[PDB]
Amino acid sequence: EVLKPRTLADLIRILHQLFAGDEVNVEEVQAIMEAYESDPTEWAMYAKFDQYRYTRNLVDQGNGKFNLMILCWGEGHGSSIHDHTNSHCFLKMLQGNLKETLFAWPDKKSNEMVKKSERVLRENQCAYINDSVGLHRVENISHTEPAVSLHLYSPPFDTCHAFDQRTGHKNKVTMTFHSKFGIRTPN
């Protein structure tokens, strides 16, 4: 009975409705994002890759309620261990596979960080995280194929923290966009 978007445009339209109000049903959003069947013809214009690290490509600003973006992971590309600045964060696979490792939060004492969960996100799967769930790292499982993911963050945010797996120490990071609406940013 899950509402199934037939196109990415459909999905965006639904998301505008689901985030219009004050409450967001996380499980409902997750199921509808998962139900969209990734179609590369519909998102190729956002899939702009870089040789050395993943790229963040803005798709939609959600009437200020969320950022919707596509992240392009080249061969072997991965993220830092990071938090999500008190937002809801949905991650759906569009191509390939990402390994998600969930980490416990450090305390002030320096220590090796503790893994709480490790999984591979399957085709079209939508995962969910917020700061109460934990920290995470995501990485392309493949050194021969890319991965592409669709991220919805609500409310939008432009900074987070990256964490050193050896110590738990963190640094603030300002996130930048490689492209917006299919158009490369100045860089």
**Residue numbering of the annotated binding site for Fe cation:** 82, 84, 136
Q: What is the CA radius of gyration of the chain?
A: 16
Residues 6 or more apart whose Cβ sits within 8 Å of residue 23? none
Q: Are 118 and 58 in contact (CB under 8 A)?
A: no
Report residue 88 CA to chain centroid gap.
10
Q: Which residues are annotated as a binding site?
A: 82, 84, 136
CB 32 within 8 A of CB 57: no
Per DSSP, the three-state class of 78 is: strand
Side chain identity at 39, as an amino acid letter? D
Amino acid at the residue 114? V
**Do 146 and 49 form a contact (C-beta atoms < 8 A)?**
yes
The CA angle 42-177-86, to the nearest 5 degrees, is 100
